[PDB]
Write a protein that binds this ligand. Structure first.
Ligand SMILES: [Cl-]
Ligand SMILES: [Cl-]
Ligand SMILES: [Cl-]
Ligand SMILES: [Cl-]
Ligand SMILES: [Cl-]
Ligand SMILES: [Cl-]
Ligand SMILES: [Cl-]
Ligand code: NA
Ligand SMILES: [Xe]
Ligand SMILES: [Xe]
Length: 129
């Protein structure tokens, strides 16, 4: 599923991401925009052989199990496929673990490079919510 911006904002809000660990909803929407272009099915292979999954591009090195990332953990206790669902619950739940992990949203390289420090509220501007 490719979310619309406002539709994703709504979904993220519903799932308790707005201001989760202090990160306003625009941060999450922005991160999702640049991580996946709001596409729940987004996948990207990393050079280390791990893969990033879903609307927030959660990595199999730590967070999910894909059966093909040797020595990996599965800290969200989920198959990485769960992260590709049109329903964002698993992505959100895993994102919450990630962002609690100590480096906050810097875990998401696109957030750090494209969202951090920017007018992230623009991403939820005009949305009803
Ligand atoms: Cl957009
Ligand atoms: Cl915001
Ligand atoms: Cl991540
Ligand atoms: Cl497996
Ligand atoms: Cl694995
Ligand atoms: Cl684990
Ligand atoms: Cl933080
Ligand atoms: Na893993
Ligand atoms: Xe991929
Ligand atoms: Xe998400």
């Amino acid at each position: 599923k490719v979310f619309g911006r406002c539709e994703l904002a709504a979904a993220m809000k519903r799932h308790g991401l707005d201001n989760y660990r202090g990160y306003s909803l625009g941060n999450w929407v922005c991160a999702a925009k640049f991580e996946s272009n709001f596409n729940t099915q987004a996948t990207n292979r990393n050079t280390d052989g791990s893969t990033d999954y879903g609307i927030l591009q959660i990595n199999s090195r730590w967070w999910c199990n894909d059966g093909r990332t040797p020595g990996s953990r599965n800290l969200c206790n989920i198959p990485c496929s769960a992260l590709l669902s049109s329903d964002i619950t698993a992505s959100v739940n895993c994102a919450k673990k990630i962002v609690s992990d100590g480096n906050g949203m810097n875990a998401w390289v696109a957030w750090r490079n494209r969202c951090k420090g920017t007018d992230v509220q623009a991403w939820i501007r005009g949305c009803r919510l």
